[PDB]
């Protein structure tokens, strides 16, 4: 049906922290909750019955298939055919007892890189009739917790369970750099909008930035809880960080101030910016998918799921959101403007 906006309100949940600081609730500008490219609501349109907890989700480009990472395998679902209740293929990646933790498409959509609770990352050719393993990257760290691909498609970064960030030349499957610094597992990763900086979160309560050309750590932010997720605003300036403590913090990159956002009751497991950068989502162990205005975090929508929300992805045109669940499924939403 047609839906209409209906305004709600909460005790103040979004705070601006200054250099002092000095936390003041944010006075939302007129285009905080409504405007061009700002979602009106989101509607659930599919449920993908993976049958194991879904630690990683990715949507194809063009949007057509969804990849869900569970135990042992990635399942491929054709969401363009409405009636399908089962995957159209399955990518068997690691020990059946071990979880896939991250999967990423190359910018051009023809290859998927999969990492998880094993020392090998598999690289999958998606053109070949039935999908097949093209190559493997064999780390000496026991697990990968998060992957990122460079925008030029040449490199894959792997967040290792030892805290190291591995940088892999995809052409010849060689480790070309290793970023050392995190003293506990690196849990999350993104790349700056100009492609030159890497940003990582860790179970050592830090966010680190790394110069990709020079190879060195640039910045370190220390927090009072573990970092589980992060995302760099595609239009720059802002880094969103989701915490074990339930806070989302939006850091002003190379600046003194930040926002602290309080609409989760538990760990912020994952986060993703829309491609337009004007809003982002966070998912919680408290079962919530939250949509937020960039940078100051006005609440655009909330969707409560049946179980913890481990993972998420947003389609290239910002039309769909997919989340992965502790209830052993993924959920496809249409974003309604």
């Amino acid at each position: 049906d047609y839906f209409q906006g209906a305004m709600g309100s909460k005790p103040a949940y979004s705070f601006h922290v200054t250099a002092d600081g000095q936390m003041q609730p944010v006075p939302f500008p007129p285009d905080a909750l409504i405007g061009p490219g700002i979602p009106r609501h989101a509607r659930q349109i599919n449920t993908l019955n993976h049958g194991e907890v879904v630690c990683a989700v990715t949507i194809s480009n063009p949007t057509r298939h969804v990849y869900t990472g569970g135990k042992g395998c990635v399942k491929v679902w054709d969401i363009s055919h409405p009636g399908n209740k089962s995957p159209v293929s399955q990518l068997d990646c690691l020990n059946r007892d071990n979880y896939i933790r991250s999967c990423k498409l190359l910018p051009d959509g023809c290859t998927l890189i999969v990492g998880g609770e094993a020392s090998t990352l598999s690289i999958w050719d998606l053109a070949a009739p039935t999908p097949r393993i093209k190559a493997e990257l064999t780390s000496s760290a026991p697990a990968c917790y998060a992957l990122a691909i460079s925008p030029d498609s040449k490199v894959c970064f792997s967040c290792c369970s030892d805290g190291n960030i591995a940088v892999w030349d995809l052409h010849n499957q060689t480790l070309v750099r290793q970023f050392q610094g995190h003293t506990d597992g690196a849990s999350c990763i993104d790349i700056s909008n100009d492609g030159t900086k890497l940003w990582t979160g860790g179970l050592d309560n830090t966010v680190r930035s790394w110069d990709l050309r020079e190879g060195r750590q640039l910045q370190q932010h220390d927090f009072t809880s573990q970092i589980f997720s992060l995302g760099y605003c595609p239009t720059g300036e802002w880094l969103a960080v989701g915490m074990e403590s339930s806070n989302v913090e939006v850091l002003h990159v190379n600046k003194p101030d930040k926002y602290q956002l309080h609409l989760h009751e538990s760990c912020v497991l994952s986060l993703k910016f829309a491609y337009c950068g004007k809003w982002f989502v966070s998912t919680g162990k408290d079962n919530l998918l939250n949509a937020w205005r960039t940078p100051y975090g006005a609440s655009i929508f909330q969707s409560k799921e049946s179980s913890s929300v481990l993972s998420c992805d947003i389609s290239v045109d910002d039309k769909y959101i997919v989340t992965g669940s502790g209830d052993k499924k993924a959920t496809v939403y249409e974003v309604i403007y």
Binding site: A143, E244, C267
Partner: peptide, 5 residues
């Protein structure tokens, strides 16, 4: 293995 969920 670290698993946050």
């Amino acid at each position: 293995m670290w698993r946050p969920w």
